[PDB]
Design an enzyme around this catalytic site. Structure first.
Site, PDB file in Angstrom:
ATOM      1  N   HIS A 121       6.321  12.644   6.845  1.00 12.47           N
ATOM      2  CA  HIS A 121       6.085  11.230   6.563  1.00 12.47           C
ATOM      3  C   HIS A 121       4.612  10.908   6.339  1.00 12.47           C
ATOM      4  O   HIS A 121       4.305   9.751   6.040  1.00 12.47           O
ATOM      5  CB  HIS A 121       6.670  10.325   7.661  1.00 12.47           C
ATOM      6  CG  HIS A 121       5.943  10.360   8.980  1.00 12.47           C
ATOM      7  ND1 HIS A 121       6.540  10.811  10.140  1.00 12.47           N
ATOM      8  CD2 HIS A 121       4.703   9.942   9.338  1.00 12.47           C
ATOM      9  CE1 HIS A 121       5.693  10.691  11.148  1.00 12.47           C
ATOM     10  NE2 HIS A 121       4.568  10.173  10.689  1.00 12.47           N
ATOM     11  N   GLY A 163      -1.059   7.321  15.036  1.00  8.00           N
ATOM     12  CA  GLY A 163      -1.869   8.470  14.693  1.00  8.00           C
ATOM     13  C   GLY A 163      -1.658   9.694  15.557  1.00  8.00           C
ATOM     14  O   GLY A 163      -2.275  10.730  15.291  1.00  8.00           O
ATOM     15  N   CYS A 183       1.206  11.289  15.724  1.00  9.26           N
ATOM     16  CA  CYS A 183       2.158  12.158  15.033  1.00  9.26           C
ATOM     17  C   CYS A 183       1.506  13.466  14.621  1.00  9.26           C
ATOM     18  O   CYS A 183       0.326  13.509  14.264  1.00  9.26           O
ATOM     19  CB  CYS A 183       2.724  11.462  13.794  1.00  9.26           C
ATOM     20  SG  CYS A 183       3.587   9.962  14.200  1.00  9.26           S
TER      21      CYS A 183
HETATM   22  O1  Y6J Z   1       2.906   6.364   7.108  1.00  7.34           O
HETATM   23  C1  Y6J Z   1       2.356   5.323   7.292  1.00  7.34           C
HETATM   24  N1  Y6J Z   1       2.711   4.454   8.411  1.00  7.34           N
HETATM   25  C2  Y6J Z   1       3.737   4.744   9.430  1.00  7.34           C
HETATM   26  C3  Y6J Z   1       4.191   3.661  10.176  1.00  7.34           C
HETATM   27  C4  Y6J Z   1       5.141   3.852  11.167  1.00  7.34           C
HETATM   28  C5  Y6J Z   1       5.636   5.126  11.428  1.00  7.34           C
HETATM   29  N2  Y6J Z   1       6.639   5.241  12.498  1.00  7.34           N
HETATM   30  C6  Y6J Z   1       8.005   4.771  12.226  1.00  7.34           C
HETATM   31  C7  Y6J Z   1       8.817   6.016  11.844  1.00  7.34           C
HETATM   32  C8  Y6J Z   1      10.263   6.015  11.348  1.00  7.34           C
HETATM   33  C9  Y6J Z   1      10.687   7.362  11.091  1.00  7.34           C
HETATM   34  S1  Y6J Z   1       9.476   8.384  11.431  1.00  7.34           S
HETATM   35  C10 Y6J Z   1       8.310   7.362  11.906  1.00  7.34           C
HETATM   36  C11 Y6J Z   1       6.252   5.809  13.814  1.00  7.34           C
HETATM   37  O2  Y6J Z   1       7.044   5.906  14.696  1.00  7.34           O
HETATM   38  C12 Y6J Z   1       4.793   6.278  14.035  1.00  7.34           C
HETATM   39  N3  Y6J Z   1       4.563   6.519  15.456  1.00  7.34           N
HETATM   40  N4  Y6J Z   1       4.849   7.647  16.119  1.00  7.34           N
HETATM   41  N5  Y6J Z   1       4.490   7.495  17.412  1.00  7.34           N
HETATM   42  C13 Y6J Z   1       3.960   6.233  17.579  1.00  7.34           C
HETATM   43  C14 Y6J Z   1       3.434   5.521  18.690  1.00  7.34           C
HETATM   44  C15 Y6J Z   1       2.960   4.209  18.538  1.00  7.34           C
HETATM   45  C16 Y6J Z   1       3.010   3.591  17.270  1.00  7.34           C
HETATM   46  C17 Y6J Z   1       3.531   4.290  16.168  1.00  7.34           C
HETATM   47  C18 Y6J Z   1       4.006   5.620  16.324  1.00  7.34           C
HETATM   48  C19 Y6J Z   1       5.192   6.231  10.692  1.00  7.34           C
HETATM   49  C20 Y6J Z   1       4.229   6.033   9.692  1.00  7.34           C
HETATM   50  C21 Y6J Z   1       1.230   4.844   6.345  1.00  7.34           C
HETATM   51  C22 Y6J Z   1      -0.080   4.462   7.046  1.00  7.34           C
HETATM   52  C23 Y6J Z   1       0.808   3.373   6.439  1.00  7.34           C
END
Ligand code: Y6J
Ligand code: Y6J
Lengths: 305, 304
Positions: free
Chosen positions: A41, A143, A145
Site C-alpha cells: 500500500h 508511518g 507500517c
Molecule cells: O498510503 C497513504 N495513506 C494511508 C492511510 C491509511 C492507511 N491505513 C488504512 C489501511 C487499510 C488497509 S491497509 C491500511 C492504516 O491502517 C495505516 N496505519 N497502520 N498503522 C497505523 C497506526 C495509526 C494510524 C495509521 C496506521 C494506510 C495508508 C498515502 C499517504 C496518503
C-alpha cells in the site's frame, strides 16, 4: 530472579530497516540481500486506499517512483514486483549487514518481538502475541507500517510479521514475509471485523508456572480436574480449549516445579470462578496470556543469542 | 495507536557487551573506547562475598588474571583500577563500535531499558523504572551481573545503570557507571533493607493521559482538586508527593488532551479513594507507574 515481558535484542534487525517513499507515502522496508520488502500500500494515494486495484496501481509505477534510503544513503531501485500484499524492490546493492534469516509463518498464541520504526529509523522494541483472532495489540502510529516482528535462534533471525494496518478498533494486522495476511484481513481501507478474541489458555498456565518459580504460590490448591472438566469451565470464560498438545508443551515447567499440569489447571479453574480476591500474581491483577511456555523456560534459563 | 511498555533498540549497546572472567567468576562488561567496565565483585570467590575486602582482593590480581572476550576476539588488559564498586580494565584496543555516549545518574521515578546479558551475549531487552527506594524490579539470573541500563536520545547512548546484585527480597540493585550504588546498598551478600517503596505519582498521571489519548475516558470525572488537597491523599495512599515541576512536565500532555493537570489529579484521587471497581485502564487492572511523561510523549509522537 524476576519476570518481565522481554523482547529479543534488536541489533540484527536494526541494520536491515530502510525508508521507502513512493511519492506521497513513506513507510518502512526490510533490506535483506538486494531486496527491500514493504507493504504494497506504499503505492496508494489517500483515496486509492478505499478500493485499490493493486495490479493497476503497480503497473503505473516506475522504479524511479520508489525512493529507498538507508540512513542518508539512497539505494537505486532497479526493479519492482509484488508477492501477495508485499512489495519487493530490487536494489543495486546487497545489504552487507544482512543476518542469517528465515521467513516463518507463526501460529496463533505464539509470541515475537516488534521493532517499531518510523521513516526507516528504529524507535523501540516490544514483545507481542499473535491473538487467537490473528490480530496483535501493539503500539503503531502513522508511518509505522513495514515494521517487522521476529524471533531469534542463536544467530538466525526468523522474521514472522510485517505491520500493515490498524483496524478501526485500534488493533493491528499484518502479513508474513510472503505477503499473506494473518487472519481474514485485506489491505484496503474498509471496515473489517476481527473475530471474537479468546484468551490463550496454554500461555496463562505457563505464566502461572513462571509465578511459582519466582515465589508466588498462593493460588495453588489441592484440587484435581480432568482436561475435559477444565475445558468445560474454560469455554464459559472465553478461554481457548486446552489440548493434550498443550499439556505436553507444559511438561518441562511441570517437572521443574513438581506441579502436575492438570493440578495447575485446577488452580486456574479456581482463579476464573472466584477471581483473584484482590491479590496479584507477578505484579499483575489480571491473568496474563502473552508468554508462551518456551518464553518462560528461556527467561528462567537465560538463553543468549 | 496502542500503548506498550517499550524498550529502546538495543543494537548500539549490543556492540559494547563483552565477557569478563577473573579466575572463577564470569560476568558481563561494557567496552567503550579502550576501557571495559564491570562490577568489582568479579574478583570475588563465593567465600569472599559475605564480607569482601575489595582493596586486598584487587591487590592479589594482575592484568593477566583478567580474561576479556568480545565475541571471541580476546582483548589484552594493560591496566586495572577500581572506581567505587566498578572495575575499569584498560585494554589495548578501542571498541570500534563505540557509540556516542554519556554516563548519567538517573533520578528515582525515571525509566531506562535493560539489556540482560549472560557470558557477554545479549539475551533480551526490557524497560525498567528506578523505584523511589532505589531498587529495580528486573529479570536477572545468575551471571547477569554487568548488564547495563541506558536511554537513547537520537544518536547518544546515556548509560545509567549496571546490575550488581539481587537482594533477599528478590528485587535488584546496582550502580551508575561510576560505580556508585543507587540507594544504600553495598556489594556484599548481606541482608540489606531497601526503604519503604512508594508509587511514582507523576508517572501514573502521564499514563492516565496516555489512556485518554488512546480512548479510555471512563475514569474522567466532574471533580477537581488542588495540589495541596491531592498531595494529602497521595500521602495516605503511599504515593510520591506531586510538585509544581511535575505539573510542568505534564504540560504537553495536558495540552493535547485538553485536560488540565489538576483535573487529572481529581480523577486519580477518585481512583485511589474508590478503587477501580474491577474496571481496566489501557489493559491494566492496576494503576501503572513505570511510564514517565517523556515515555508517553515519545510513544504517542513517534520519536526515533
Ligand atoms: O498510503 C497513504 N495513506 C494511508 C492511510 C491509511 C492507511 N491505513 C488504512 C489501511 C487499510 C488497509 S491497509 C491500511 C492504516 O491502517 C495505516 N496505519 N497502520 N498503522 C497505523 C497506526 C495509526 C494510524 C495509521 C496506521 C494506510 C495508508 C498515502 C499517504 C496518503
Ligand atoms: O560468587 C561468585 N559470584 C557471585 C555470586 C553471587 C553474587 N550475588 C550476591 C551479591 C551481594 C552483593 S554483590 C553480589 C548476586 O546477587 C548475583 N546476582 N545478581 N542478580 C542475580 C539473580 C539471581 C541470582 C543471583 C544474582 C555475586 C557474585 C563467584 C563466581 C563464583
Amino acid at each position: 530472579s524476576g519476570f518481565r515481558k522481554m523482547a529479543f535484542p534488536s541489533g540484527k534487525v536494526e541494520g536491515c530497516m530502510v525508508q521507502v517513499t513512493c511519492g506521497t507515502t513513506t513507510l518502512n522496508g526490510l533490506w535483506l540481500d538486494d531486496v527491500v520488502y514493504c507493504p504494497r500500500h506504499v503505492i496508494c494515494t489517500s483515496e486509492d486506499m478505499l478500493n485499490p486495484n493493486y495490479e493497476d496501481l503497480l503497473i503505473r509505477k516506475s522504479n524511479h517512483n520508489f525512493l529507498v534510503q538507508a540512513g542518508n544513503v539512497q539505494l537505486r531501485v532497479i526493479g519492482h514486483s509484488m508477492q501477495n500484499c508485499v512489495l519487493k524492490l530490487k536494489v543495486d546493492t546487497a545489504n552487507p549487514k544482512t543476518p542469517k534469516y528465515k521467513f516463518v509463518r507463526i501460529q496463533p498464541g505464539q509470541t515475537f518481538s516488534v521493532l517499531a520504526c518510523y521513516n526507516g529509523s528504529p524507535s523501540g522494541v516490544y514483545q507481542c502475541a499473535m491473538r487467537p483472532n490473528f490480530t496483535i495489540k501493539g503500539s503503531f502510529l502513522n508511518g509505522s507500517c513495514g515494521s517487522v516482528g521476529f524471533n531469534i535462534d542463536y544467530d538466525c533471525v526468523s522474521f514472522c510479521y510485517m505491520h500493515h494496518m490498524e483496524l478501526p478498533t485500534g488493533v493491528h494486522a499484518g502479513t508474513d514475509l510472503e505477503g499473506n495476511f494473518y487472519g481474514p484481513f485485506v489491505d484496503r481501507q474498509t471496515a473489517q471485523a476481527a473475530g471474537t478474541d479468546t484468551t490463550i489458555t496454554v500461555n496463562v498456565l505457563a505464566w502461572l508456572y513462571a509465578a511459582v518459580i519466582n515465589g508466588d504460590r498462593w493460588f495453588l490448591n489441592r484440587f484435581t480436574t480432568t482436561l475435559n472438566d477444565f475445558n468445560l469451565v474454560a469455554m464459559k470464560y472465553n478461554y481457548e480449549p486446552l489440548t493434550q498438545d498443550h499439556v505436553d508443551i507444559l511438561g518441562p515447567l511441570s517437572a521443574q516445579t513438581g506441579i502436575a499440569v492438570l493440578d495447575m489447571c485446577a488452580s486456574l479453574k479456581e482463579l476464573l470462578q472466584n477471581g483473584m480476591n484482590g491479590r496479584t500474581i507477578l505484579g499483575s491483577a489480571l491473568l496474563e496470556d502473552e508468554f508462551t511456555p518456551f518464553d518462560v523456560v528461556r527467561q528462567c534459563s537465560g538463553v543468549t543469542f
